[PDB]
Amino acid sequence: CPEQDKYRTITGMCNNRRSPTLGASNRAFVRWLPAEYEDGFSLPYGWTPGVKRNGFPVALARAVSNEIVRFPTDQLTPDQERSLMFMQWGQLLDHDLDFTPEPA
Amino acid sequence: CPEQDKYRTITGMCNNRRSPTLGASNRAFVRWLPAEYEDGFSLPYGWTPGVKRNGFPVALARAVSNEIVRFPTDQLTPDQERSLMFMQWGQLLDHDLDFTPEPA
Amino acid sequence: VNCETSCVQQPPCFPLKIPPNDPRIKNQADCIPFFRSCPACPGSNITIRNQINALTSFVDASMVYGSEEPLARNLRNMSNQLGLLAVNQRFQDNGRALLPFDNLHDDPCLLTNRSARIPCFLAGDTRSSEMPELTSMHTLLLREHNRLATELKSLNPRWDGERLYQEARKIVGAMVQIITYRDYLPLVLGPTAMRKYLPTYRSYNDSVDPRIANVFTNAFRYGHTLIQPFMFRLDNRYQPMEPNPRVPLSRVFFASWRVVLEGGIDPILRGLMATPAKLNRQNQIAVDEIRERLFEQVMRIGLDLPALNMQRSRDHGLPGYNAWRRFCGLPQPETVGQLGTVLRNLKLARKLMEQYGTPNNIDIWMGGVSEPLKRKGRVGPLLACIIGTQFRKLRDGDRFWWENEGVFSMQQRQALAQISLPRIICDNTGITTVSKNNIFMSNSYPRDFVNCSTLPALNLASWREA
Amino acid sequence: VNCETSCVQQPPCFPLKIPPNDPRIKNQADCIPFFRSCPACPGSNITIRNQINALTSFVDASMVYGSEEPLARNLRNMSNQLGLLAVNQRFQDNGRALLPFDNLHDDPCLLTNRSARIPCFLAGDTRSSEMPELTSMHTLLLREHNRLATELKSLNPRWDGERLYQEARKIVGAMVQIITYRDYLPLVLGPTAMRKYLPTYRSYNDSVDPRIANVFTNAFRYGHTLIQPFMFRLDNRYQPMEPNPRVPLSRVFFASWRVVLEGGIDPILRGLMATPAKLNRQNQIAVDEIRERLFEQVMRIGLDLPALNMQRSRDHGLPGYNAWRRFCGLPQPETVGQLGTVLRNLKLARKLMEQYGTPNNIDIWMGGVSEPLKRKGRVGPLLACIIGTQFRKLRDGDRFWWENEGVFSMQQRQALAQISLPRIICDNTGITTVSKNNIFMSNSYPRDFVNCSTLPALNLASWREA
Ligand SMILES: *[C@@H]1O[C@H](CO[C@@H]2O[C@@H](C)[C@@H](O)[C@@H](O)[C@@H]2O)[C@@H](O[C@@H]2O[C@H](CO)[C@@H](O[C@@H]3O[C@H](CO[C@H]4O[C@H](CO)[C@@H](O)[C@H](O)[C@@H]4O)[C@@H](O)[C@H](O[C@H]4O[C@H](CO)[C@@H](O)[C@H](O)[C@@H]4O)[C@@H]3O)[C@H](O)[C@H]2NC(C)=O)[C@H](O)[C@H]1NC(C)=O
Ligand SMILES: *[C@@H]1O[C@H](CO[C@@H]2O[C@@H](C)[C@@H](O)[C@@H](O)[C@@H]2O)[C@@H](O[C@@H]2O[C@H](CO)[C@@H](O[C@@H]3O[C@H](CO[C@H]4O[C@H](CO)[C@@H](O)[C@H](O)[C@@H]4O)[C@@H](O)[C@H](O[C@H]4O[C@H](CO)[C@@H](O)[C@H](O)[C@@H]4O)[C@@H]3O)[C@H](O)[C@H]2NC(C)=O)[C@H](O)[C@H]1NC(C)=O
Ligand code: HEM
Ligand code: HEM
Ligand SMILES: *[C@@H]1O[C@H](CO)[C@@H](O)[C@H](O)[C@H]1NC(C)=O
Ligand SMILES: *[C@@H]1O[C@H](CO)[C@@H](O)[C@H](O)[C@H]1NC(C)=O
Ligand SMILES: *[C@@H]1O[C@H](CO)[C@@H](O)[C@H](O)[C@H]1NC(C)=O
Ligand SMILES: *[C@@H]1O[C@H](CO)[C@@H](O)[C@H](O)[C@H]1NC(C)=O
Ligand SMILES: [C-]#N
Ligand SMILES: [C-]#N
Ligand SMILES: [C-]#N
Ligand SMILES: [C-]#N
Ligand SMILES: [Ca+2]
Ligand SMILES: [Ca+2]
Ligand SMILES: [Cl-]
Ligand SMILES: [Cl-]
């Protein structure tokens, strides 16, 4: 890292001079809690048939969505104190913060 | 991880049910602070000629030992309140807690 | 195994299985496509699998400039010394700039309308075209950079292309920071959580880890609960712009052709300002436009965003609801009755217990968006904690935070305190009447609107090198 | 390549450079051998390099039993159903068991005395032969395991080999926990840091991360400052055991032939009990037996333990002194004057600044062992914080902690509270006079010593299966 600079690097590298990659692009996320995988280190809960999580069957994500999230659109409540721009800035800001790559 | 168990596994696996590798052998250490490497991710300070650490030259480990650690052996002060067993239990205990492997 | 065309569960695919009596997918041999997030250390039997952030965590407008050097270079107009970002060479929006087109192998935007042949847009981030409202925001910031570079060139004649680009980029970054922390976050968190997690800024602390936490990538998806089922477009007098003022969201995803051929970003920006967001209620969590018909036009089957969020948290090995509550110092309900009290909703607690068996296993997004919203906020205690904690780190651990001493002069900071999203819209579009501040609260025309001529522009005088 | 036979700095080596005018290594172009610790994710350009713990972090006597399944099985006597650990088949120590020999490729123990041909010992941990005093402790616990298994077999005739082994192993692990937390840690940390970092145990907490922290591997090396330059051996009346009662440490490293051919573990254990440890003082930090002559008989030149500790911290990417002071909530000295105040030694502060330039760069081990010792403790505030913090996590985060509900019965817990190292020595050796508790403080014969016959045996009645 340069002893002195004038602007941000494009990758975020060198923002933190003691630990140059912190906040820089193409680096693993930090973990605020230890990860919880079916095998302890790699497989996601719900991977292996019949394997429970913490004493209970893993609920299908699509089943949770159908039973708890799904609702009749005519019931929609327009937020009287928020604009749709509130939603949009949120997504734009998200896209300044994180993108988690996947294989093509 | 078995629903119930009566004894520790040999690897330490399954001690923590939610994250079964925690405390288990042949896993990375946890970091209490982000790592500080010359390039930010791998090379140790003292690796590349001329690369300072935070504005100052990297002090040779051997120079620090010579200038600060070295002392006349006949000046050794016996601890009137600790046995050498206190030294030895510490090493024995250390060998229950950690061994950082190296290539042969 | 092709995760998009097969339902076989093999690396790197983790397809979502279909439950019996599904309201849409009656064939249980089908599935919802899902690719596992790339592992930070592929094939390791030592490391606990982690995922990768391809962007800079800092609030530095990397969605405008890029987070990698080749891209950042390609997004720049290198044909002169004006320090501008490259603009579309084939199309304009009423004489104004559009983002350049991208060159993608399998362009999804092309599939949203075969005969229009409008590819996806090229931006600092790869998702600029995911919805036309987002593209409009990207396009707005691209224009503001070029507008800033132009004024700067007049004030400082000696500044070369590089200097102008960096100075305009530095201003845009501070604008994103100001709009986000001054206007946006207080309305997300509410007053109490805002004061608790974002106390008054002191200065840069190089011991504050600024990385995005893996959990934040799923928790901040709370915004999915704010999504309306339509894209609303309004004409210059804020009336439904004919003949298609309310397009179903399932026909706008990656529909870049709508920006180019259906009136530019003005109708879209006016729609965002004068239409209410959707409110998150405990039995009105997220709409079927994203729950049943997500990306329906650009693939074999419509996805389910809420379900993907939950499958993603599992892919990422994220702890369940009670573990995150504990992390946050919040009580951890163990019975349906205790969960009922925490959610102030017994009926929702029962549904969650029927699905999960225990509050320990509730997936973080589901548990987070299930909590009652904090007063004057749009997230509950758990999400407020995760989101508030993340943004304080992105602020305090950023050496280039706009208020950090040395980044801007005192007069430059005084000038920047006058910026606003409404003004930026005024400076870069044909829109002459915009929302009163706070733009994120105002949503009713004409009650909440004012003339652009009443909003003082950013005064760049203190940027004079003289 | 061989990091032991050349000074080329290339993977996986990181040789220690030599300062001009070194009092021992006169050719400045040479070096001290050093292999970089194995990376958790080999060759990655995404991950931040981290190191690996080959052992279980729990205080579970894994140095006796092994931390990997094949080894654990090989350490056991599978010739019968007695649940015993295998013992040496070629040599005994006055009729008592010795650890079996290992089968190593370049066995370092054979080099310490070429004519004796005694290889290194096989134990749960690979370092059992590093010094004979360590070997004696490993041998002591192996015998105690077999002693326990034998008694449990009389108590419970129907218990098979697996049951007897597991039950004995369980008691041994509990013994190591009690000696460590009841007798050892209080004398390391002092009463004040003991109360702060290790408050009364309440319950197993499955949210406490029990992993060893990278910094602890270096911080717990504070113990190197305790090492005396000799191995002391004493006869049955605690008088020097001729003809060699004081052997220079540089001739006992990996000297497994001394345990086998020079009187077994009894003279060694007596020496550990009746000899003072070395006291750490600010101008008497570590002896030349380890600083100039470490592993002299098995390396091309003598190594320097203090220097290796510092090079290891850099290999591991560990933050400097002030970052750890900050992590611990301790003031961070920024000037030589401030450092002088913190260390209560301006002379030492000046020396550290001449070497490091800034207290921000002082290596964790060096800065840690430089701090003045806490009252009735043998580490300063920084090391107390790191060490205390670690042991609380190993206690609270261990589902098999001896005091955890369901591990032992109340009556078994009452029996275990009576165990002590002096009694364990009495039960497994020919020594009939041992130290008064606390064994780690007691160090002067006959003043601090008592007859083994005054110490009650561990009562195993409550292990009888009704
Ligand atoms: C079981 O043990 C759990 C772990 O406890 C730790 O380790 C043991 C060995 C003890 O030493 C213990 O003292 C340690 O805390 C324990 O859970 C822990 O509980 C604490 C207290 O609630 C949690 O702290 C809170 O954290 C949140 C989240 O931010 C934290 O993480 C980020 C990211 O790393 C850091 O940057 C932050 O500094 C935090 O460390 C904070 O928001 C919160 O602070 C805010 O609220 C408090 C209270 O109003 C205010 O005083 C503050 O100013 C803030 O406004 C706390 O700091 C901790 O996260 C949590 N850890 C885990 C792993 O869950 C649990 O309580 C124990 N249970 C029992 C029954 O013993
Ligand atoms: C610059 O920022 C630093 C980071 O601060 C955090 O993030 C920012 C954004 C804020 O949210 C801030 O509030 C956060 O704390 C900051 O350094 C931090 O300072 C705190 C307080 O001194 C440190 O906490 C102390 O930690 C030690 C070590 O244990 C910790 O880590 C382990 C391992 O992960 C956990 O298991 C523990 O739960 C702790 O989290 C503790 O020993 C100590 O607690 C003990 O002492 C206190 C005080 O007597 C008692 O009340 C307790 O009961 C214990 O006896 C503290 O919890 C924190 O480690 C440190 N972080 C870093 C990275 O250094 C710094 O102060 C900021 N500077 C300025 C000028 O703002
Ligand atoms: C007989 C006394 C001791 C030694 C001989 C000895 C030697 C070492 C060596 C060679 C290392 C590695 C140095 C390097 O980094 O290349 C080392 C590491 C550790 N020690 Fe040592 N040690 C002796 C005695 C002690 C005592 C009394 C300790 C604690 C009270 C102590 C601790 C440690 C620790 C924790 C390590 C790191 C272990 C790991 O591999 O993770 N040592 N010591
Ligand atoms: C136009 C509105 C929005 C979408 C369309 C949309 C879509 C997604 C999709 C497809 C994902 C990935 C799902 C998966 O895990 O497979 C997704 C991820 C994230 N979002 Fe989305 N989102 C829209 C809108 C929002 C809003 C308003 C957000 C926040 C206020 C928001 C956030 C996020 C986040 C942080 C992610 C993860 C990003 C990453 O890859 O790290 N979204 N969204
Ligand atoms: C670069 O800038 C000039 C001047 O504004 C403009 O005419 C040209 O089209 C721009 N090129 C690109 C690729 O944007
Ligand atoms: C597709 O784009 C064309 C312009 O080429 C437009 O006329 C048509 O209406 C669009 N299709 C739909 C279904 O809107
Ligand atoms: C196994 O136990 C028997 C009986 O104690 C003993 O004779 C034999 O030597 C032991 N074998 C090993 C390898 O220790
Ligand atoms: C080596 O061991 C033999 C016994 O095998 C012993 O007689 C000799 O003294 C030892 N060598 C040294 C240098 O002590
Ligand atoms: C969402 N992107
Ligand atoms: C020390 N080992
Ligand atoms: C592209 N223009
Ligand atoms: C070897 N026995
Ligand atoms: Ca960014
Ligand atoms: Ca262990
Ligand atoms: Cl996380
Ligand atoms: Cl660490």
**Residue-wise DSSP of C16-57:** EEPPTT-SS---TT-EE--BPPPBSSTT-SSS---BEE-S-S
Which helix or strand (DSSP H or E) is residue D464 part of? Answer: none
Query: Residue D415 belongs to what domain range?
Result: 1-466
Contacts of residue D200, Cβ cutoff 8 Å, sequence gap at least 6: none
Angular region, D264: left φ>0, alpha ψ -120 to 50, beta rest: left
Ordered by start, the domain boundaries in chain B are: 1-104
Across-strand partners of C13? Answer: C35
Give D227's DSSP letter. -
What span, in angstroms and rounded, lies between the C-alpha atoms of B32 and C398?
20
The one-character DSSP state at C183 is I
Q: Which of C75, C79, C143 to mutate to test the pocket of ligand 5 (most atoms within 8 A of CB)?
A: C79
Give the other-Cβ count within 10 Å of C460's Cβ.
Answer: 17
**Considering only CA atoms, which of C206, A8, D335 is closest in space to residue B33?**
C206
Other CB atoms closer than 10 Å to residue A27's CB: what's the count?
26
| Neighbour-count burial of A39, counting CB atoms closer than 10 A to its CB (0-12 exposed, 13-18 middle, 19+ buried) | middle
Q: Which amino acid is at D329?
A: G
> For position D1, which CATH number holds?
1.10.640.10
After which residue numbers is chain A interrupted with C–N beyond 2.5 angstroms? none
Nearest by CB to residue A15, choosing from C227, C304, C398, is: C398
Residues 6+ apart with CB under 8 A from D405: D203, D204
Dist CA A86 CA C276 (whole Å): 9
CB-CB contact of C270 with C439 (8 Å): no
Q: Report the gap between the CA of C76 and the closest CA in chain B (Å).
A: 28
D44·C41 Cβ contact <8 A: yes
Q: Is D329 left (phi over 0), alpha (psi -120 to 50) or beta?
A: left
Indicate the residue type of D69.
Answer: E
Give the pairing type, strands D433-435 and D276-278: unpaired
Terminal-residue alpha carbon distance, chain D: 62
> Is A37 in contact with C49 (CB distance < 8 Å)?
yes
Instruction: Map residue C154 onto helix, strand or coil.
Output: helix
Interface contact flag, C278 A12, Cβ < 8 Å: no
Q: Which of C44, C46, C360 to mutate to test the interface with B (most CBs of B within 10 A)?
A: C46
The whole-angstrom separation of Cα C401 and Cα C408 is 9
Fill in the DSSP letter of residue B66. Answer: I
Residue type, C239: Q
Ranges of H-type helices in chain B: 61-64, 84-97
The residue to mutate among D91, D109, D110, D113, having the most atoms of ligand 8 within 8 angstroms of its beta carbon, is: D113
Could you give the CA distance from residue D231 to residue C447 in angstroms, rounded to a whole number?
89
Residues facing A27 on adjacent strands: C53
Nearest C-alpha neighbor of C58 from the set A32, A85, B40, A8: A8
Q: Which tokens in the block code for residue C13? A: 């695919």
- Looking at the partner chain, which of D47, D52, D323 has a beta carbon nearest the beta carbon of C40? D47
Cα–Cα distances in angstroms (integers) from residue C365 to residues A30, A71, C386, C394, in the given order: 18, 17, 11, 21
Per DSSP, the residues of D263-306 read T-SHHHHHHHHHSEEEPPBTTB-S-HHHHT-BTGGGSSS-B-HH
Q: Tell me how long chain C is.
A: 466
- For the record, the structure tokens of C144 come out as 């503001």
Count up the domains in chain C and report the number: 1
Has A2 been annotated as catalytic? no
D89 lines ligand 12 (CB under 6 A): yes
Per the CB < 8 A criterion, the answer to whether B92 and D124 are in contact is no
Resolution, angstroms, 1 dp: 1.9
> Which atom of ligand 10 lies at the shortest distance from residue B95's CA?
2
Task: Name C214's Cβ contacts closer than 8 Å, sequence gap at least 6.
Answer: A29, A30, A31, A32, A35, C50, C51, C316, C318
Q: Is D113 buried (19+), middle (13-18) or exposed (0-12) by CB count in 10 A?
A: middle
Q: Which atom of ligand 5 is nearest to the CA of C88?
A: 14
Is the CB of residue D374 less than 8 Å from the CB of residue D192?
Answer: yes
Residue type, C5: T
A36, D206 Cβ separation under 8 angstroms: no
Give the DSSP per-residue string, D410-454.
HHHHHHHTT--HHHHHHHHSS--EEEPSPTTT--STTTTEEEGGG
Best residue among D215, D298, D305 to mutate for probing ligand 3's pocket (most ligand atoms within 8 Å of CB) is: D305
Q: Which of C221, C329, C333 is nearest to C280 (CA)?
A: C221
**Beta carbons of C48 and B34 less than 8 Å apart:** no
CB C168 within 8 A of CB C150: no
Pairwise CA distance, residues C169 & C56, whole Å = 15
Which of D48, D209, D319 has its CB closest to that of A18? D319
**Least CB–CB distance from B21: residue in C48, C209, C323:** C48
* φ, ψ for residue C463, nearest 5 deg: -90, -5
Q: Report the candidate in C69, C246, C59 with the shortest Cα–Cα distance to residue C141.
A: C59
Ligand nearest to the CA of C92: 11
CA–CA gap between residue D347 and residue C4 (Å, rounded): 69
Q: How many CB atoms lie within 10 A of CB D37?
A: 22
Distance C93 CA to ligand 5 centre (A): 15
Secondary structure of residue D45 in the 3-state scheme: coil
Nearest CA in chain A to C290: A70
- Neighbouring chains of B at 3+ CB pairs under 8 Å are A, C, D
CA-based nearest distance D54→chain C, Å = 10
**CA C108 to ligand 6 centroid distance, Å:** 16
Catalytic position from the list A95, A97, A98, A100: A95
Residue type, C103: N
Task: Say whether residue D323 is in contact with chain C using an 8 A CB cutoff.
Answer: yes
Neighbouring CB atoms inside 10 A of C138's CB total 24
Q: How far is Cα C230 from Cα C253, in angstroms, rounded to an integer?
A: 11
- Stretch 347-406 of chain C: residues touching chain D, C-beta under 8 Å: none
Report the C-alpha gap between C268 and C232 in whole angstroms: 7
* Ligand 7 cavity residues, CB under 6 Å: D 77, 79-80, 84, 86-87, 89
3-state SS assignment for residue D332: coil
